[PDB]
Design a protein around this ligand. Structure first.
Ligand SMILES: CCCCCCCCNC(=O)[C@H](Cc1ccc(OCc2ccncc2)cc1)NC(=O)[C@H]1CC[C@H](CN)CC1
Length: 246
């Protein structure tokens, strides 16, 4: 075996995706790659239970056919998948009903939970991540010359409270209460194209809690332009309801 959610079996680097670093392999064991039937990566996701993956709804808007998608679990290299990697076809799609940028994928079979494939923990309903909390984003997205293309990367980003993120100098009112902001004022470190749908996790005493789903930004890693994430805590009741009833 039993593995606790949110507790990697390979301790992450937590280096203080553009910028950041290449992760230690299998140190973010909930990170998944959402792929076409031909195995091409197009989005991230987070394993939240053996049969359930949380991702961005925009990753699924082109096809309502679960057979258009497969989930890659336990990976480090994008291209040359490791022998233990699990490739599981999606069975059903559940888009958030108020059309927010979050969705669930039910897997056609449960993922086998191992020291390299472990779900993230969900937050408590309506939890608010406080300003300046240190969190991490992971993914196989663009690197903008910061090295590590093709390998799972991580970046440490502080949360910026919405009232600050919405100032003119930053995102000028765009951020909704069901979203959160994270990034460095000076830029240089951020999630980027190919990271959407992936996790934003924040360490709480002894485990990582999934607080955000990578959603959008005004470019990547620009100064004064932090990334925007769906605020997972505002969707926990809906997520739990989908899992309970499907
Ligand atoms: C020619 C089609 C191949 C596109 C695959 C490349 C995916 C790049 N992903 C994105 O641009 C997504 C949006 C996206 C676009 C198209 C997508 O669909 C492609 C697709 C093609 C074929 N089948 C399924 C999906 C999916 C997602 N946005 C992000 O990753 C955000 C960029 C800004 C960051 C700011 N911090 C936050 C992350």
């Amino acid at each position: 075996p039993s593995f606790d959610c949110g507790k990697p079996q390979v301790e992450p680097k937590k280096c203080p995706v553009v910028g950041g670093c290449v992760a230690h392999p299998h140190s973010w064991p909930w990170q998944v790659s959402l792929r076409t039937r031909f195995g091409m990566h197009f989005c991230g996701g987070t394993l939240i239970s053996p049969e359930w993956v949380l991702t961005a709804a925009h990753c699924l808007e082109k096809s309502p056919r679960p057979s258009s998608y497969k989930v890659i679990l336990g990976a480090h290299q994008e291209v040359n998948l490791e022998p233990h990697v699990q490739e599981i076809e999606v069975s059903r799609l559940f888009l958030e009903p108020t059309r927010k940028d979050i969705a669930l994928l039910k897997l056609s079979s449960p993922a086998v939970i191992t020291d390299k494939v472990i779900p993230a923990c969900l937050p408590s309903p309506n939890y608010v991540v406080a300003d300046r909390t240190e969190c991490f984003i992971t993914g196989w997205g663009e690197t903008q010359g910061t090295f590590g293309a093709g390998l799972l990367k991580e970046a440490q980003l502080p949360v910026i409270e919405n009232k600050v993120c919405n100032r003119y100098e930053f995102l000028n009112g765009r951020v909704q209460s069901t979203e959160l902001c994270a990034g460095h004022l000076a830029g240089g470190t951020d999630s980027c194209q190919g990271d959407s749908g992936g996790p934003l996790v924040c360490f709480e005493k002894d485990k990582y809690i999934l607080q955000g789903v990578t959603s959008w930004g005004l470019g990547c890693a620009r100064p004064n332009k932090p990334g925007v994430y769906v605020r997972v805590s505002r969707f926990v009741t809906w997520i739990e309801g989908v899992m309970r009833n499907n």
